[PDB]
Amino acid sequence: MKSGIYQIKNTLNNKVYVGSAKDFEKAWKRHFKDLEKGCHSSIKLQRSFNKHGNVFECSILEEIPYEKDLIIERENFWIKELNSKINGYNIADA
Amino acid sequence: KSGIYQIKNTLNNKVYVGSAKDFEKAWKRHFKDLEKGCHSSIKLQRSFNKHGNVFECSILEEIPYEKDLIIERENFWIKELNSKINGYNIAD
């Protein structure tokens, strides 16, 4: 499916931003449109983008139905497993 | 709680027309973006930076959030309020 949890990874240091979406492609386009404008929801990801340019790759981590409870659970799951909060670009829990 | 709304500049009545599944929620996100200088509408962002605390949010039409219907009514109000040429909505 086109829904589930994904990651935006900095190919230079492997740090990631974990997110969830109903449509991966549409979500990724939105996130990069914001980055290009300097307005991504994560100031950590934005500053990384500002500094390194576009060294990021988007990819699906887990395809799952966009179900509120399941999404929050798996989104926080991946954040913890990839340590994307402390050593990533996430700024909070799902 | 869903439908078409407007963010109006009470100084000149110019508006930004938008749609939402949850009015209060949408307005909250739009103003946080304005405070951060990150509203998707640069025209609204500039107006906000220039005039400050003069904007008022209100519902134009309450209707269930059905993509097509929303789009149609969204366009109806944009044209009715001339919000693209003399407003804060993005021009085609």
3-state SS, B39-75, equals CCCHHHHHHHHHHCCCEEEEEEEECCCCHHHHHHHHH
Give residue limits of the domains in chain A: 1-94
**d(C-alpha A11, C-alpha A56), whole Å:** 6
**d(C-alpha A50, C-alpha B44), whole Å:** 24
Tokens at residue A89, please? 């670009």
Tokens at residue A84, please? 């994307």
Do the Cβ atoms of B54 and B34 come closer than 8 Å? no
Residue B18 DSSP symbol: E
**2.40.30.110, 3.40.1440.10, 3.40.50.2020, 3.40.50.1100: CATH of B1-92:** 3.40.1440.10
Give just the sign of the alpha carbon dihedral B36, B40, B42, B44: negative
Chain B residue whose CA is closest to A39: B38
Core vs surface per residue B59-68: b (16+ CB within 10 A) or e: ebeeeeeeee
Chain A residue whose CA is closest to B39: A39
Residue B57 DSSP symbol: E
**3.30.70.3270, 3.40.1440.10, 3.40.630.30, 3.40.718.10: CATH of A1-94:** 3.40.1440.10
Asked if A91 is an interface residue toward chain B (Cβ–Cβ < 8 A), one would say no
Resolution, angstroms, 1 dp: 2.0
> With an 8 Å Cβ cutoff, are A37 and B38 in contact?
yes
Q: What is the number of other CB atoms lying within 10 angstroms of the CB of residue B24?
A: 10
**d(C-alpha B66, C-alpha B22), whole Å:** 13
Tokens at residue A88, please? 């990533």
Q: Residue A24's closest CA among A56, A55, A60, A66?
A: A60
- B32 to chain A, closest Cα gap in Å: 11
Q: How was this structure determined?
A: X-ray
Tokens at residue B15, please? 């508006």
Q: Beta-strand (E) ranges in chain A?
A: 4-10, 16-21, 56-63
**d(C-alpha B53, C-alpha B31), whole Å:** 11
Q: Calculate the CA dihedral of residues A18, B21, B32, B73 and round it to 10 degrees.
A: 120
